[PDB]
């Protein structure tokens, strides 16, 4: 459910960051732009900056610099059929979700009901209760987290 | 016979004109104006009381200019060009800058 | 550089604009998330990339789209390059 690769990540710096705190700024930018974001159907759960290889030349574009940082990336991803468990969360009568460590599960409308919040999918679930689900369909991630249409196991 | 021509062309690559030195100075000056750290020796609080163009020229002359230029499939620093041509163009530029009250 | 700066929009009017690398539409921003409505409706996950162009260019391209012409942009991903020391060359004559 994961793998490890070596590759370059591209980042953009402003001139005022080309100071003695260059490594800190590079690390902050890399984490901000790649840490928990889903790109091309995969997430990078861990990023290691080599610190032992030659850094390539930076490319000047208008008033900014573009740098390729070498790194070892631990890619993680999910597919259909996997079983996960997470905390239920109800915000309104239509939006009910399951929050996990790094996964969000969305429940279809024709699965249960919301009343008070509480969920009734054949069993009573309190807002914040822990429930098990199985991923069914994929979508686009939001706020650095996977999104999948899933049904309660 | 191809290798001889290639060597001649590689040597020809090292000559310098106004366009290249002007571009290098422009890039370095833009970066310095927008707030990069100068790379001059004996850096101290007295360095910030000087003229920025003086700092750029000093960086070029002492071999710490960070700009790299791609010309004929190669990557050259300012010091890889012919030395006499660099002196020639820099002398002219400094004269006209003095006429303009910049230097 | 001078002509480039003259013909561009003012540096004080910059803003972040994203374009979809698949169909060329300007990406919308819904609830703070950049999204391509056309491609999302087709169940696709294309790359969104930042561009720095003039407003008139966007108007011209959108009108061309309205006339039925699709304009797609690609981007350069040249592999990283490294500097190497070079041997010295003199270039003076033998006198």
């Amino acid at each position: 459910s994961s793998f490890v690769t070596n590759g370059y990540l591209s980042v953009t710096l402003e001139p005022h960051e080309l100071t003695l705190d260059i490594k800190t700024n590079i690390r902050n930018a890399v984490y901000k732009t790649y840490l928990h974001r889903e790109i091309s159907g995969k997430m990078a759960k861990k990023i290691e900056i080599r610190e032992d290889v030659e850094l390539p030349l930076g490319e000047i574009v208008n008033n900014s610099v573009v740098i390729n940082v070498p790194c070892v990336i631990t890619y993680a991803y999910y597919h259909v059929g996997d079983i996960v468990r997470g905390t239920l969360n109800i915000e309104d009568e239509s939006n009910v979700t399951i929050q996990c460590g790094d996964l969000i599960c969305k429940l279809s409308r024709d699965s249960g009901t919301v009343s008070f919040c509480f969920f009734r999918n054949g069993n009573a679930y309190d807002n914040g209760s822990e429930v098990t689900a199985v991923l069914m369909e994929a979508q686009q991630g939001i706020e650095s987290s996977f999104v999948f249409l899933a049904n309660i196991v | 016979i191809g290798n001889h021509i290639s060597a001649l062309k590689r040597r020809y690559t090292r000559r310098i004109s106004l366009f290249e030195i002007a571009g290098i100075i422009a890039e370095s000056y833009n970066l310095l104006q927008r707030g990069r750290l100068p790379l001059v020796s004996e850096f101290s609080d007295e360095t910030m009381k000087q003229n920025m163009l003086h700092v750029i020229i000093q960086e070029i002359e002492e071999g710490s200019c960070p700009i790299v230029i791609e010309k004929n499939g190669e990557l050259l620093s300012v010091n890889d060009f012919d030395k006499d041509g660099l002196k020639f163009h820099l002398d002219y530029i400094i004269k006209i800058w003095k006429l303009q009250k910049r230097y | 550089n001078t002509i480039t700066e003259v013909l561009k929009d003012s540096e004080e009017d910059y803003q972040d604009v994203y374009v979809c690398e698949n169909c060329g539409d300007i990406a919308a921003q819904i609830k703070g998330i950049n999204t391509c409505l056309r491609c999302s409706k087709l169940n696709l996950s294309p790359l969104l990339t930042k561009i720095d162009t003039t407003h008139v260019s966007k108007v011209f391209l959108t009108q061309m789209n309205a006339r039925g012409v699709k304009v797609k942009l690609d981007f350069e991903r040249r592999p990283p390059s490294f500097y190497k020391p070079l041997d010295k060359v003199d270039l003076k004559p033998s006198f």
Binding site: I60, I67 | G23, L31, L37, I67 | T4
Partner: peptide, 29 residues
């Protein structure tokens, strides 16, 4: 180049410019 706000391949724009960060990263506070 004018259409997309790029630098024309003329004069100073005939070359491509990079910055070598090697010396900056070899300095320690």
């Amino acid at each position: 180049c004018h259409f997309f706000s790029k630098v024309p391949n003329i004069g100073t724009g005939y070359y491509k410019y990079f910055i070598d960060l090697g010396l900056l990263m070899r300095m320690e506070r």
